[PDB]
Amino acid sequence: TLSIAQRRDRVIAYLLMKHRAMHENTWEWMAAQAAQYGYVDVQGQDYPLV
Amino acid sequence: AGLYTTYQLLEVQRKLKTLPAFFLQWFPRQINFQEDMIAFDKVIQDVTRV
């Protein structure tokens, strides 16, 4: 029943929500590290450990 | 007596067992359908990754 325009609309809406939620999960994770250990190790595949 | 002992028949002692419904309380939805099969689509979206 979806047009390819509508499949695209759905998937993009989902991806926007995923991005917002992934950012907010990173905020939660950073807050948890800060509150607990008093420091946070930031890392990534594209971000050296500091 | 002699030919045969006489009797009084007292009321019959019937014992109608049953298997009363217990599990069908968690199956409240009834569908009568003539299609061959029923189909479900299950979708999981983890949104807790950093």
Backbone angles phi, psi at A28, to 5 degrees: -55, -45
Question: Which is nearest to A29 in space by CA: B9, B2, B49, B37?
Answer: B49
User: DSSP states of A2-47 as a string?
Assistant: --HHHHHHHHHHHHHHHHHHHHHHHHHHHHHHHHHHS-----BTTB
Question: Which is nearest to B49 in space by CA: A25, A19, A40?
Answer: A25
Q: Alpha-carbon Rg of chain A, whole angstroms?
A: 17
Any chain B CB within 8 A of the CB of A26? yes
Query: Experimental method used, please?
Result: cryo-EM
d(CA A39, CA A46): 20
With beta carbons less than 8 A apart as the criterion, state whether A42 and A50 touch. Answer: yes
Nearest to B50 among A14, A18, A29 (CB): A29
Q: Any residues with CB less than 8 A from the CB of B40 and at least 6 apart, and which?
A: none
Helix and strand numbers, DSSP H then E, in chain B: 0, 0
Resolution value in angstroms? 3.3
